[PDB]
C-alpha cells in the first residue's frame, strides 16, 4: 500500500530539538477505563517530537519492512502541493488536525485508491464525512489520545483570561511594575459560574479539573450525563447553549465540529451572556462565528477569548483572532504536546497494524465505516 | 489617631479604570471554616479597585468621620519620602505587600507613636518582626483574605510553564504557526510529581486544585498535615525541601519568609532536582536565591520558573528575573486581584474597628502582639 502522510515542518532550530527533559510519565489508562494504544511495538521513545516531517510519527521502518511506501510532506495547499499530486494513488492518508490535509469532496473524488483516512489526533472534521461515507472510505482517529492535554490547556486558558496573566507578563518583561494596570482586569475564578459545551471525554475532564476551584458548574449536551456524574460534580444541565450562556461567567467549548455545531457560538448566543464574560475554545474554531467573536471582544461583551484552534489551518498571518483585544490564543498545539504525541503516534500505528492484518480497528476509534457514521462517530457526530 | 497608608499608583488610564464587569461572586467562608471579614460596614462595592492611591482601601470616610487623620501616598522610598516624613507621629501604618512600605529596624526606631503595623494582604515579612517585638508594636494581616487568589495564580503558572504557553502566545500574536516550535518544550502535567513547600492555607488550596490533574502529590512542612488531608490528596511527606526536590518534576512554594526559609531554594536544592524541572514561587522572592534561579534556567537545570513575587519591590527595570530564559513572571499581583482586594480591604477595616473600639483583633490575624509572635505568627513564622 501507499501511505501518504502530511505533518508539520521541523523546528526552526533543526531536528531533533533540544529537549528540556529526557523522559515523560507512563500513562496506561484514560479516566473512563479505555486503555492507551496497544500496537505490537513502537519505534520511538515517548517524549520525542513525532509530529513533524523528520519525526514521521515513528512509522517508516514499520511500513517499509512490510513493503509499503511511505511519503511524508508538509506541503498541503492547493492542487500543486505534494499532497494533492500524490493523492490520486494513495491507499491511506494520515494527517494531524494541527496541520490538516483537508479532504474536501473534490479531493476525495480525485483520490482513486483512498480507503482509509486516518487522523493522527482527535477530530476528523477536516475530512468531508458525507463524501467519505459515499466513497466507502473508513475514517478513524485515536480517541482520548490527547484529550487530557486539551483539558489542561483549556483550564490554563480560563485562568489566564480571568486573572489577566498575559498582559501582566508583558509588563514584567518590559520593565514595568504597574500593579493597578495588571489588576484592573484581574479576577479570581472562585465562585464564578463555569459551563462546558459537551461533557464528553474532554469536557468531563475539564469539569473535574474545575471542581476544586469552587466554581458553580454547568454543561449543555444533546444527551444528559448520568445522574451519578451530575451528583459527583454538582452539575446543572441546560438543554441548549443559549440557555447556558444566560447564567455562565465562563464557557469552555468541547464538542466536535459538524453541521449542527457549526457557528453554534455566534452573536445570538454570545449576546445572552453577561457583559464581561469569558469564552475558551479548544474544540474547533468554526463552532464559533469568527467575526462575531471579534465584535464581542471589541464591545466588551466578552472580556476575553482564548483557544488554540483556528480556521482555516494554518491561520493566515492576517487572521483577525491574532490581534483582537483581550485574547489568549496559541497556534493549534494542545493536542500536540510531546506527551500527547506519544499516545496518538502509538495509536496511529495500532490502527495501521489492525488494518493491514485484517483485524478490526477499535470501535471507539471509528468515525466512519462501511458507508455510515460508526463507533464514536455515530455517538458524537452528525452529518445531517 | 494618625493613619499613614501606602498604596500603589492609580492605573495609567486614570481612576476609576474601565471595569470589565460590574460585580463579583459573594464569598462567605474560607475552606477551613474561617469566616470572611466582618466589618460593621464597607464603603465600596466588591469589585472596585481599592489598592491604589485613589481607591484608599475604602477607608477615608470611616476614618475621617471618627476624627482620625488619613494620609495616603505611593511615595515610599528613602527618608525624604512622604512615608518616612509622616512616619514619626503615625499611630498606625498600613501597606500592601505588592507595594510595601518596608518597616526596617531604623524606621521603627523613628516611629515614636507607632502601635499597629497593618498589612493589607497576607505576609508581613516587609516588617522587621524582631524590631516590632522590641518596640511593642502589634503586627497583623488579613489571614486567608487573598489566599485562594494565589492558589489559582500558582496553578495557572504551573500549567503555563509545563505546556509552554507564553512563547506560543507570542507566536500567535506575531503571525506565526510553527507548531514544532510551540510543542518542542510542551508537556502535559498529568502523571508528573508535584510538590508544595508548606501545606498551609495556600499550599493546601493548591494541592486540592492539583488533585484532579492526576499528578503524584508531595509536600514538605515542619509538621505532618492531618490524616484526613494526607488521605484526601494521597500526599507523600518529606522532612526537607532538599528531599522533596529529588523526586518532584514541579515544586510550588507556599511558605512564609523568615530566616529559616530565606534562600532555601539555592543551588544546593535546585541541583537535587532532575534536569528540566519546574519551579513556581508565589510566596516570597527571597525564599529563593535570586541569581541561583537565573543560572539554573540558563543551564537548563530548571526548564522553567514563574512567580509574581520579587525582591526588592518594586523590582527595578533591570531586575534579572524579567528576561532570564524560560520564565513566566508577573509583577506582584496575585493577592491583589479585584476579588482579593474586596476581602483584604474589608478585613483591614474590621481590624481598625476592633482596634479603635478596644476589642481584640482576631487571633488568626495576629502576627506579633505584646512583644512576641502571636496568633498565626506563632504558628507559621520564626524570628531566627
Ligand atoms: N485542541 C486540540 O488540540 C484538540 C481538540 N479536540 C476537539 O475536541 C472535540 C471533543 O473531543 P472529545 O471530548 O475527546 O470527544 P467526545 O466524542 O468524547 O465528546 C464530544 C461530546 O460532544 C457532545 N456533542 C455532540 N454534539 C453536540 C451538540 N450539538 N451540542 C453539544 N454537545 C455536543 C457529545 O455529547 P452528546 O451526545 O450528549 O451531545 C459528545 O459526548 C473533538 O471532536 C475535537 O474537535 C480534540 C482533541 C485535541
Ligand atoms: N503572591 C501573593 O500575592 C501572596 C503571597 N503570600 C505568601 O504566601 C505565604 C503563605 O500564606 P498562607 O498559606 O496563607 O500562610 P499560612 O500561615 O496558612 O501557611 C504557612 C505554612 O508554612 C509552613 N511553614 C512554616 N515554616 C516553614 C518551613 N521552615 N518550611 C516549610 N514550611 C513551613 C507552615 O506549616 P508548618 O508549621 O507545618 O511548617 C504553615 O502551615 C504568606 O506568608 C505570604 O508570604 C500570601 C498571600 C498573597
Q: Does B382 contact chain A (CB < 8 Å)?
A: no
Residue B223 burial (C-beta neighbours within 10 Å; 0-12, 13-18, 19+): exposed
- Could you give the CA distance from residue B87 to residue B70 in angstroms, rounded to a whole number? 12
- How far is residue A318 CA from its own chain's centroid? 22
Helices then strands (H, E): number in chain A?
14, 13
Judged by DSSP in three states, B382 sits in coil
Instruction: Indicate if ligand 1 lies below 6 Å from the C-beta of A201.
Output: yes
DSSP annotation of A249 reads: S
Cα of A265 from ligand 2 centre, angstroms: 43
Residue A383: inside a domain: no
Q: Which of A9, A163, A209 sits opposite B156 (nearest CB)?
A: A163
Looking at the fold, whether A102 and A140 belong to one and the same domain comes out as yes
B213 found inside a domain:
yes
Can you tell me whether residue A62 is helix, strand or coil?
helix
A169/B contact by beta carbon, under 8 A: yes
CA gap B6, A52 in Å, rounded: 54
Q: Which three cell numbers stand for residue A18?
A: 533540544
Q: In whole angstroms, how far apart are CA A201 and each of A25, A31, B253?
A: 20, 8, 32
Q: CB distance B27–A191 less than 8 Å?
A: yes
Which residue is listed with cell 498541503? Answer: A76
CA atoms within 13 A on the CB side of B378: 11
Cell of B189: 502535567
User: Which residue shows C-alpha cell 470501535?
Assistant: A363
As to burial, measured by CB atoms within 10 angstroms (0-12 exposed, 13-18 middle, 19+ buried), residue B20 is buried
User: Is B96 within 8 Å of B8 (Cβ atoms)?
Assistant: yes
CA-to-CA separations, B259 to A146, A254, B269, in angstroms, rounded: 45, 48, 17
Are A351 and A39 contacting, i.e. CB atoms less than 8 angstroms apart? no
Domain shared by A263 and A297, yes or no? yes
Structural element, H or E, at residue B64 = helix B60-65
Task: Tell me whether residue A380 is in a domain.
Answer: no
Residue A11: CB atoms within 10 A of its CB come to 22
Cα–Cα distance list, A79 to A86, A135, B60 (Å): 10, 20, 71
Q: Any idea what the CATH number is for the domain that residue B360 is in?
A: 3.40.50.720
What is the tally of structural domains in chain A? 2
- The reply to whether B382 falls in a domain is no
**Helix %, strand %, coil % for chain A, to 5?**
35, 15, 45
- Continuous segment of H or E residues that includes residue A307: strand A302-307
| Residue A253 near residue A283 (C-beta atoms within 8 A) | yes
Please indicate whether, in this complex, the C-beta atoms of A187 and B338 are within 8 angstroms of each other: yes
Which residue in the block uniquely carries the three cell numbers 494504544? Answer: A37
> b/e per residue, A168-194, with b = 16+ CB within 10 A?
bbbbbeeebbbbbbbbbbbbbbbbbbb
The upper half-sphere exposure of residue A171, i.e. CA atoms within 13 Å in the direction of its Cβ, equals 21
B14 lies within 8 A of chain A by CB: no
* Strands A366-369 vs A372-373: parallel, antiparallel or unpaired: antiparallel
Measured from the Cβ of residue B245, the count of other Cβ atoms closer than 10 Å reads 24
Give the closest of A179, A191, A314 to B332, CB-based: A179
Q: Per-residue DSSP letters for B185-243?
A: T----TT-EEEEE--SHHHHHHHHHHGGG-PEEEEE-SSPPPHHHHHHHT-EEESSHHH
Its domain, for residue B24, covers 1-145+336-374
Tell me if A347 sits within 8 A of B195, measured CB to CB. Answer: no
Q: Are residues B99 and B221 in the same domain?
A: no
- Joined grid coordinates for residue A77: 495547499
Contacts (Cβ under 8 Å, ≥6 apart) of A50? A44, A56, A57, A58, A341, A342, A345
Element (H, E) at B71: strand B69-73
Contact flag B212-A214 (C-beta cutoff 8 Å) = no
Specify the pairing of strand A366-369 against strand A138-140: antiparallel
Which set of grid coordinates corresponds to residue A103? 479532504
Asked whether residue B151 falls in the same domain as residue B76, the answer is no
Phi, then psi, of B166 in degrees rounded to 5: -65, -45
Q: Are A255 and A200 in contact (CB under 8 A)?
A: yes
Distance B254 CA to ligand 2 centre (A): 5
**Contacts with A, B 233-292, CB within 8 Å:** 274-277
User: Which ligand approaches the C-alpha of residue B313 most closely?
Assistant: 2
CA distance B264 to B287: 5
- Shared-domain flag, residues B176 and B134: no
Three-class secondary structure of residue A84 per DSSP: helix
CA quadruple B273, B275, B278, B283: dihedral sign: positive
Do both A223 and A80 map to the same domain?
A: no
Contacts of A336 in chain B (CB under 8 A): 179, 182-183, 186
Instruction: Please list the alpha-helical segments (H only) found in A112-265.
Output: 129-135, 147-163, 165-174, 179-183, 201-210, 227-233, 241-247
**Cβ neighbours of residue B315 closer than 8 Å, sequence gap 6 or more:** A177, B321, B322, B331
State in Å: Cα B169 to ligand 1 middle: 24
The angle formed by the CA atoms of residues A57, A59 and A64, to the nearest 5 degrees, is: 155
Q: Based on the domain organization, do B98 and B125 belong to the same domain?
A: yes
Burial of A26 (0-12, 13-18, 19+ CB in 10 A): exposed
For residues A356 and A3, give the distance between their C-alpha atoms in angstroms, rounded to a whole number. 12
Q: Domain for residue B326, yes or no?
A: yes
What is the DSSP code (8-state) at residue A108? H
Q: Residue A327 domain-assigned?
A: yes
Selection from A26, A30, A29 nearest residue A205 by Cα = A30
Helix (H) or strand (E) holding A195: strand A193-197
Q: How far is the C-alpha of B269 from the C-alpha of B285, rounded, in Å?
A: 15
- Strand order across the beta sheet in which B2-6 lies: B69-73, B2-6, B92-95, B116-119, B138-140, B366-369, B372-373
> What does this entry list as its resolution, in Å?
1.4
Q: In what helix (H) or strand (E) does residue B158 lie, and over which residues does it extend?
A: helix B147-163
Which residues are paired to A179 by β-bridges?
none
Cβ–Cβ under 8 Å, residues B352 and B62: yes
Q: Which three cell numbers stand for residue A83?
A: 499532497
| Residue A159 included in any domain | yes
With respect to residue B230, please indicate whether it lies within any of the assigned structural domains.
yes
Q: Are residues B138 and B55 in the same domain?
A: yes
Measure B203 CA to ligand 2 centroid, in angstroms: 7
Bond from prior residue into A16 cis (ω within 30 degrees of 0): yes
B70 backbone dihedrals φ, ψ, rounded to 5° = -135, 110
Distance, CA of A368 to CA of A268 (rounded, Å): 32
Torsion angle of alpha carbons A319, B165, B153, B44, nearest 10°? -10
Does A84 reach chain B within 8 Å, measured CB to CB? Answer: no
Backbone phi, psi, residue A307, to 5°: -175, 175
**Residues of B forming the active site:** 146, 284, 313, 332
Q: Verify that B318 and B181 share a domain, yes or no.
A: yes
d(CA A216, CA B352): 34
CB of A284 shorter than 6 A to ligand 1? yes
Neighbours of B277 (CB within 10 A): 23
* Residues pairing with B236 in the sheet: B218
Taking every pair of Cα atoms in chain B, the longest distance, rounded to a whole number of angstroms, is 65
Contact B151, B379 (CB under 8 A): no
DSSP summary character for residue B255: P
- Ligand 2 centroid to Cα of residue B296, in Å, is 24
In whole angstroms, what is the distance from residue B262 CA to residue B129 CA? 14
Distance, in Å, from the CA atom of B180 to the CA atom of B183, rounded to the nearest integer, reads 5
Q: In the numeric block, which cell numbers belong to residue B242?
A: 532538599
Residue A47 backbone class (left: φ over 0; alpha: ψ -120 to 50; beta: rest): left
Among the atoms of ligand 1, which is closest to the Cα of residue A205? 13
Task: Round to whole Å and give the CA distance between A201 and A32.
Answer: 8
Integer Cα distance of B143 and B34 in angstroms: 9
Distance, in Å, from the CA atom of B225 to the CA atom of B198, rounded to the nearest integer, reads: 9
Q: How many Å apart are CA B362 and CA A281, to the nearest integer?
A: 45
- CA A197 to ligand 1 centroid distance, Å: 8
Q: At what angle do helices A147-163 and B147-163 cross, to 10 degrees?
A: 130
The answer to whether residue A166 neighbours chain B at the CB level (below 8 Å) is: yes
A304 neighbors B153 (Cβ within 8 angstroms): no
**Strands A138-140 and B2-6: what pairing?**
unpaired
* Residues A37 and A75 grouped into a single domain: yes
What residues of chain B lie within 8 A of the CB of A192, using their CB?
25
| Cβ within 8 Å, pair A183-B336 | yes
Let me know: does B328 contact B297? Beta carbons within 8 Å: no
Q: CB–CB of A186 and B323 under 8 A?
A: no
* Rounded Cα distance, B284 and B253, in Å: 8
Distance CA B333, CA B48 (A): 15
Ligand 2 atom 4 nearest Cα:
B335
Tell whether the torsion through CA atoms of B270, B276, B282 and B286 is positive or negative. Answer: positive
Q: Nearest by CB to A331, from B156, B179, B318: name it.
A: B179
Give the distance, in angstroms, between the CA of residue B169 and the centroid of all CA atoms in the same chain: 26
DSSP per residue, B115-154 = -EEEESSS--TTB-HHHHHHHT-EEE--TTTTHHHHHHHH
Q: In what order do the strands lie in the sheet with A236-238?
A: A236-238, A216-220, A193-197, A250-253, A277-281, A302-307
User: Could you count the other beta carbons within 10 Å of the beta carbon of residue B112?
Assistant: 10
Please report the DSSP string for B292-336 in residue order.
Answer: HHHHHHHHTSEEEEEES--SSSSPPTT-TTTTSTTB----S-GGG
Cβ contact, residue pair A182, B331, below 8 Å: yes
User: Is residue A116 a contact partner of residue A131, using CB atoms and an 8 Å limit?
Assistant: no
- Indicate whether A245 and A347 sit together in one domain: no
On whether the CB atoms of residues B277 and B248 are closer than 8 A, the answer is yes
The grid coordinates listed for B276 are: 528540566
Q: Cβ atoms within 10 A of the Cβ of B207, count?
A: 27
The answer to whether A250 and A223 have CB atoms below 8 angstroms apart is no
Residue A135 contacts residue A190 (beta carbons within 8 Å): no
Interface of B with A in 287-346 (CB under 8 A): 300, 303, 313-315, 317-318, 322-323, 328-334, 336-341
A204 ligand 1 Cβ < 6 A:
no
Any residues with Cβ below 6 Å from ligand 2, and which?
B 121-123, 146-147, 150, 197-198, 200-203, 220-223, 254-257, 260-261, 282-284, 308-309, 334-335, 376, 380
Most A CBs within 10 Å, among B333, B335, B341, to test the A interface: B333
Q: Read out DSSP for A267-287? A: HHHHTTSPTTEEEEE-S-GGG
B365 — phi, psi (to 5°)? -80, -20
Strands A193-197 and A250-253: parallel
Sign of CA dihedral B33, B34, B40, B46: negative
Q: Counting Cβ atoms within 10 Å, is residue B196 exposed (0-12), middle (13-18) or buried (19+)?
A: buried
The torsion angles phi and psi of A251, rounded to 5 degrees, stand at -125, 140
C-alpha–C-alpha distance, residues B128 and B100, integer Å: 12
Cα A199 from Cα A217, distance rounded (Å) = 11
Q: Mapping DSSP to helix (H, G, I), strand (E, B) and coil, where does residue A129 land? A: helix
Q: Specify whether the CB–CB gap between A195 and A217 falls below 8 A.
A: yes
Do residues B232 and B325 both lie within one domain? yes
The answer to whether the CB of A299 falls within 8 A of the CB of A276 is no
d(CA A148, CA A144): 8
Q: Say how many residues make up chain A.
A: 384
Paired sense of beta strands A277-281 and A302-307, if any:
parallel
Method: X-ray
Could you give the angle at which helices B147-163 and B338-356 cross, rounded to 10 degrees?
150
User: Do A339 and B188 make contact, defined as CB atoms within 8 angstroms?
Assistant: yes
What is the CB neighbour count within 10 angstroms for residue B30?
Answer: 18
In the block, cell 501511505 appears at A3
**Cβ partners under 8 Å of residue A303, min gap 6:** A161, A185, A276, A277, A278, A326, B20, B21
| Dihedral of alpha carbons B48, B51, B53, B58, sign | positive
Q: How far is CA B228 from CA A55, B33, B237, B379, in A?
A: 47, 15, 14, 20
Q: Please give the Cα distance from A145 to A318 (Å, whole number).
A: 32
* Other C-beta atoms lying within 10 Å of the C-beta of residue B201: 23
d(CA A162, CA A153) in angstroms, rounded, equals 14
Active site residues of A: 146, 284, 313, 332
d(CA B120, CA A211): 29
Q: Do A169 and B329 touch (CB under 8 A)?
A: yes
Burial of residue B15 (CB within 10 Å: 0-12, 13-18, 19+) is: middle
Amino acid at each position: 500500500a501507499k501511505v501518504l502522510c502530511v505533518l508539520y515542518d521541523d523546528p526552526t532550530s533543526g531536528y531533533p530539538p533540544l529537549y528540556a527533559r529526557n523522559a515523560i510519565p507512563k500513562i496506561e489508562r484514560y479516566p473512563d477505563g479505555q486503555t492507551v494504544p496497544n500496537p505490537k511495538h513502537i519505534d520511538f521513545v515517548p517524549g520525542e517530537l513525532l509530529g513533524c516531517v523528520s519525526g514521521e510519527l515513528g512509522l517508516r521502518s514499520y511500513l517499509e519492512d512490510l513493503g509499503h511506501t511511505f511519503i511524508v510532506t508538509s506541503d498541503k495547499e492547493g492542487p500543486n502541493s505534494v499532497f494533492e499530486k500524490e493523492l490520486p494513488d494513495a491507499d491511506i492518508v494520515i494527517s494531524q488536525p494541527f496541520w490538516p490535509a483537508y479532504l474536501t469532496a473534490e479531493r476525495i473524488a480525485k483520490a482513486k485508491k483512498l480507503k482509509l483516512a486516518l487522523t493522527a489526533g482527535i477530530g476528523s472534521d477536516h475530512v468531508d464525512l458525507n463524501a467519505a461515507i459515499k466513497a466507502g472510505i473508513t475514517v478513524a482517529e485515536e480517541t482520548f489520545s490527547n484529550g487530557i492535554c486539551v483539558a489542561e490547556h483549556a483550564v490554563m486558558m480560563i485562568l489566564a483570561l480571568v486573572r489577566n496573566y498575559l498582559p501582566s507578563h508583558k509588563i514584567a518583561e518590559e520593565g514595568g511594575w504597574n500593579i493597578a494596570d495588571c489588576v484592573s482586569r484581574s479576577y479570581d475564578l472562585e465562585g464564578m459560574h463555569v459551563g462546558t459545551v459537551a461533557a464528553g471525554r474532554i469536557g468531563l475532564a475539564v469539569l473535574r479539573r474545575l471542581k476544586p476551584f469552587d466554581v458553580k458548574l454547568h454543561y449543555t449536551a444533546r444527551h444528559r450525563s448520568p445522574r451519578a456524574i451530575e451528583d459527583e460534580l454538582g452539575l446543572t444541565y441546560h438543554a441548549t447553549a443559549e440557555e447556558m450562556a444566560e447564567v455562565c461567567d465562563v464557557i469552555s467549548i468541547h464538542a466536535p465540529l459538524y453541521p449542527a455545531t457549526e457557528h453554534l457560538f455566534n452573536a445570538k448566543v454570545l449576546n445572552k451572556m453577561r457583559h464581561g464574560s469569558y469564552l475558551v475554545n479548544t474544540a474547533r474554531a468554526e463552532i464559533c462565528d469568527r467575526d462575531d467573536i471579534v465584535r464581542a471582544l471589541e464591545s466588551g461583551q466578552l472580556a476575553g477569548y482564548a483557544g488554540d484552534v483556528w480556521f482555516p489551518q494554518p491561520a493566515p498571518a492576517n487572521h483577525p483572532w491574532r490581534n483582537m483585544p483581550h485574547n489568549g490564543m496559541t497556534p493549534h498545539m494542545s493536542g500536540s504536546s510531546l506527551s500527547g504525541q506519544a499516545r496518538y503516534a502509538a495509536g496511529t500505528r495500532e490502527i495501521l497494524e489492525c488494518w493491514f492484518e485484517n483485524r478490526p480497528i477499535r470501535d471507539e476509534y471509528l468515525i466512519v465505516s462501511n458507508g455510515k457514521l460508526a463507533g464514536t462517530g455515530a455517538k458524537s457526530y452528525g452529518v445531517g
